[PDB]
Design a protein around this nucleic acid. Sequence first.
DNA 1: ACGAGGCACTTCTGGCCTCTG
DNA 2: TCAGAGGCCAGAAGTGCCTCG
Lengths: 127, 126
Amino acid sequence: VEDPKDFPSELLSFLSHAVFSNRTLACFAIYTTKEKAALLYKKIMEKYSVTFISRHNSYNHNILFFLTPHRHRVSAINNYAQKLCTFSFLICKGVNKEYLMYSALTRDPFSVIEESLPGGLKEHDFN
Amino acid sequence: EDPKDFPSELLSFLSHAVFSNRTLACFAIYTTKEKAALLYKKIMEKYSVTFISRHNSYNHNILFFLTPHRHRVSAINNYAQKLCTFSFLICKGVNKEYLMYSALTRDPFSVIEESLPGGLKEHDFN
DNA sequence: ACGAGGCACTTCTGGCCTCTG
DNA sequence: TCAGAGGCCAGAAGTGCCTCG
């Protein structure tokens, strides 16, 4: 109901917009509640052995941004993360523009709650 | 959430197989009032049941039904699971179809709704 | 009878890759 | 190159058939 139906309109140009692709990527984003972002961060971190993960503030909910050293399907990440929940909203999408998406998440009206490397894609190549 | 199996007085009728790939045409489901009303409609559309009834059982509801083709209990269960809601659901094969239905029609049990006017009689079962 | 379980699909899952603009 | 659509693939999971005891 009041739950978002997509990511914030300001992030949309950075996200993947495939509906029918079997393409795999290495940068994903997840939009969920405050409660689930905490749990998801660690779980996701361990499962996918993330080269990077950050947790962000978004309009009274949270966004998880993360890079993975291996390629995954958006639906594979989605399925893994839905099997934690039930039960609360979750939008999961591939990210096409990693620097841009990261840096947008560090500025208003978004902010960093916590991240696994300080400064992230601004301070580190993940090449 | 609540109950952990079917009422003990109906257990003799059910199949308890856990390692069988055998398929059946009679099943019963234990669940809440809200879930049983819905699974009545949806199991019938889904399996195009030859008969389906919904009954009062101790705070909750049982659904009994016969399907025109053969299914694995695990199928009926994977389907019925997908319409919960971490509300509870016991789903089992029925070995003794008539005896199960007839028990569910008498005290402590009663019929709420069934897909045939005046339910089932003994002939009907083979 | 009925539970165990061999078997045979078929559907699902989650990667690969090329094509195309 | 990029990114979405989709061919293809292999291994897992699903949901039937059967016969054996």
